[model samples]
Target: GHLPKPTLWAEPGSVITQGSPVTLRCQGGQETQEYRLYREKKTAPWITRIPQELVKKGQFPIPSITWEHTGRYRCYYGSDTAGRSESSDPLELVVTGAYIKPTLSAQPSPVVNSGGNVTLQCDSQVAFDGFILCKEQCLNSSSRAIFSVGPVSPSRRWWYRCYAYDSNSPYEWSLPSDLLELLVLG
Candidate 1:
């Protein structure tokens, strides 16, 4: 038998690929005892444990997860007797976050006339099949980050930003680049 232990530990969560299997483990007492695992929304402390078979290995699998599964998770391992209920340190699991850099640059800093087609291109250091071109007030499709728009008749000023990501990570977003300004010429 092992000596009495007090310290509890668990795995830290990060953005993982979708349709993948994730395992959660926990241990308590000299002999393994019945325990429960719970997951909750990041914004709340409400506890909800999935009612599934408790494996001897103490690993719980989350099959084919989606965006809804993004949140904080932890396990409670202990028996009804010995009043032995221990909570593993919190672990966050989710597929979200950005790793690509935002491409923000304009060919001509100064504008010249109204209804002029201004080219604004945004590219990522990382090759992302999907990227979004966004302005201070708009978000474009994920297929491309380069956006072109114009027709400012009376000296209009605008700011823009872009975002990009990969399939593996969906929870975290890349740091947005500094806002680039565009001034239309009269």
Candidate 2:
């Protein structure tokens, strides 16, 4: 019987660093078949199975990875009865060194003062705690820090910025949001 394509598979989940491991497992095979695992190097061809193990229930384990272990990995299987080998699907591993900076944006560009409230939102791929909303007077060195603000003041035009902190890494400061313009009017 002709050998079918290798049914290669891997864990489909986000891989994070900080002493974490990404294991790729492949299963699906017939008894007495020889399966090989493989990975690619930048300067070399598909290298033969290093740290190779016999397919126990047709599964392979790739673990104890570092930031350098970011790339596509695949597996191959061949049988004595089946002359040809089948290749498994490719799996991609991404290792980011740092959390992506969060972004802040305000609505109603060139905001006008008419006793209207402006809302600012911060968006990020990672989790974040509450953000600080700041209001500063351009002409005067006065600034206010508040969780939320409303009831716009009609007599002043203020500059606003949002500072978001990540719960995972509290030490890092997210990029400040763009300046927001709000004019308060009666």
Candidate 3:
């Protein structure tokens, strides 16, 4: 009935810290086009039109985040040649803060050999639908998520944080977890 699904993703991570900027990009065809981003429970979908200049992606920038922006989103595009493309996969754009934060701790120690493994655990008193371990920008993810950072030889310090989400109301997230810094040595 339509073209294949397009690609949808955020510039940074999907979990936004309140008041931060985020870009939602949807990539489709190069045949000149129109793009639409639909939000859950919202009546209107944000749309854009652009000419093809090797610019197959539609960029939606949200400057200064707000609570109302938190929710599920899907993107669609219409190539002048074809009908509407299939809706992209749903992205749960959750916002941080407004709830209890999770605690992040490194097992064994914060210092590790450059070629070994380290288990970073994210724990919280609240029953979380899932846990996310993030670098400054990466959303790496349980109530207790065990992320194994292995064969990692950054030769410098790598910092990380965590967040918890609930499937019941997945748009709102728990507070940002304390930052965990790992120092790698040879």
Local distance difference test values of all predictions, in order: 0.55, 0.50, 0.75
Q: Which lDDT tens digits does candidate 1 get at residues 1-186? A: 222332233333343445545555666554655555566545422223434355344555555445566666666655556454556676666543335456677756535466777777777765666555555644444334666767655645677766665546444445565677677656
Error of 3 at 12 (Å): 4.7
Task: Quote the lDDT for 167 in model 2.
Answer: 40
lDDT of 1 at 121: 71
Q: In candidate 2, how many Å is residue 89 off? A: 2.1
How many residue pairs clash per model?
Answer: 12, 4, 1
Which has the greatest lDDT?
A: 3
Q: Which of candidates 1 and 3 is the stronger one according to TM-score?
A: 3
Tell me the spans in candidate 1 whose CA falls farther than 4 Å from its real position: 1-97, 108-112, 141-144, 167-172
TM-score of 1: 0.42
Point out where model 3 deviates above 4 Å: 1-5, 40-57, 61-64, 79-82, 125-129, 137-145, 155-157
Candidate 1 structure lDDT: 0.55
lDDT of 2 by residue, 42-144 (tens): 4213223334453544554445545445566666666455564567776555443344444545555335467666655555555555444546511111122
Ranking by lDDT: 3, 1, 2
